[PDB]
């Protein structure tokens, strides 16, 4: 699914309002992308479907720390 | 805990022939008893070609409600109730009104 | 006819079950079908006896 | 005049049979509803 593997962002439904305030159901999608991150601890590349915000989160923290949290979450990466 | 048993001499309180004495032969699970010469029914027995050919009219015994018969004291010359008491570890029946054991 | 056979060893229990199944269970059944059996109450009595023996075997063997 | 119903045991079982209902969740709900109603025949049984 369109779920970020780091921040957990998932599509959220909402409305779009016209000038006449007409409301139609829409859906907001996270800015997901497939990226390969190099991990020195295991010395290989890991592919994660992460959002742009998640990629910023990975940069701010360590890739090792994020992987540990993912492992604790219980979902394989 | 049945007050009227297999082998008891009883009297009829209410019915076609009240006051008539007799002895019970069997008791039904529906609270009914059968006695001799109390409730006679002239059943029209059909003939059957089987081994038995009764034919005619048979004077059978009709069951009567257990509540309509009371065990007879046989000493005071009247009907009497029944109570239960434990003696030497066994439950036994006894009369009332100068109660004695059966 | 319940505690008489409680103290017997397993060998006799299997033996008595076999003759209960062999005789008075198969023979009675053939007699009843052919109409030569007049005491039909034996059939149920024999069947219950077989059940009794099997109950003992289970509580003897294994557990 | 050919009529709408042309019986066929194989088609009937493979279409409305018990295993056909259990394949999908909607069929499972169909069985669940009919159990609740107490129907004697859960499905078309051969």
């Amino acid at each position: 699914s369109r779920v970020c593997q780091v921040t957990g962002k998932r599509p959220v439904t909402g409305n779009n309002r016209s000038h006449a305030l007409n409301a139609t159901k829409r859906r907001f999608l996270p800015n997901l992308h497939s990226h390969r991150f190099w991990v020195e601890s295991e010395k290989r590349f890991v592919t994660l479907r992460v959002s742009a915000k998640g990629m910023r989160v990975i940069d701010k923290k360590g890739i090792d720390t994020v992987l540990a949290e993912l492992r604790a979450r219980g979902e394989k990466y | 805990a049945a007050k009227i048993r297999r082998d008891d001499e009883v009297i009829v309180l209410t019915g076609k022939d009240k006051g008539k004495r007799g002895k019970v032969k069997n008791v039904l699970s529906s609270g009914k008893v059968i006695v001799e010469g109390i409730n006679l029914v002239k059943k029209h027995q059909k003939p059957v070609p089987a081994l038995n050919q009764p034919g005619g009219i048979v004077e059978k015994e009709a069951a009567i409600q257990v509540s309509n018969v009371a065990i007879f004291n046989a000493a005071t010359g009247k009907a009497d109730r029944v109570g239960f008491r434990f003696e030497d570890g066994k439950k036994v029946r006894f009369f009332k009104s100068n109660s004695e054991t059966i | 006819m319940k505690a008489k056979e409680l103290r017997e060893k397993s060998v006799e229990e299997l033996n008595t079950e076999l003759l209960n199944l062999l005789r008075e269970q198969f023979n009675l059944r053939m007699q009843a079908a052919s109409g030569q059996l007049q005491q039909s109450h034996l059939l149920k009595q024999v069947r219950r006896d077989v059940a009794r023996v099997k109950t003992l075997l289970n509580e003897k063997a294994g557990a | 005049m050919k009529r709408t119903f042309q019986p066929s045991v194989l088609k009937r079982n493979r279409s409305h049979g018990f295993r056909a209902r259990m394949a999908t969740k909607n069929g499972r709900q169909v069985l669940a509803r009919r159990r609740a109603k107490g129907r004697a025949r859960l499905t078309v049984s051969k």
């Binding site: - | - | 079950e17 076999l18 062999l22 269970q25 053939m30 | -």
Partner: protein, 93 residues
């Protein structure tokens, strides 16, 4: 091993009828009722042991119970299996 007791339960009862009688007197074969499963091998072994006779071949068929209309109600009889057992030249029963 429950073969002995199994053989004591496959046989249910003999079958009596005009077809049964003519088959016995002519083809030296006995027709009898058996259990619902009653594989041909089990029937053959049971007849050899219980009746102490020699057998040649066994043919089995399944009879479907009839639908009966009892009182205000509809009912069905139970299916049963009958077997034709062909004895050899030496017959006992």
């Amino acid at each position: 091993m429950i073969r002995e007791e199994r053989l004591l339960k496959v046989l249910r009862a003999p079958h009596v009828s005009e077809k049964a009688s003519t088959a016995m007197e002519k083809s030296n074969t006995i027709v009898l009722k058996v259990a619902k499963d009653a594989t041909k091998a089990e029937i053959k072994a049971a007849v050899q042991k219980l009746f102490e006779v020699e057998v040649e071949v066994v043919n089995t068929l399944v009879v479907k119970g009839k639908v009966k209309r009892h009182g205000q109600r509809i009912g069905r009889r139970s299916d049963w299996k009958k077997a034709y057992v062909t004895l050899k030249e030496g017959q006992n029963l």
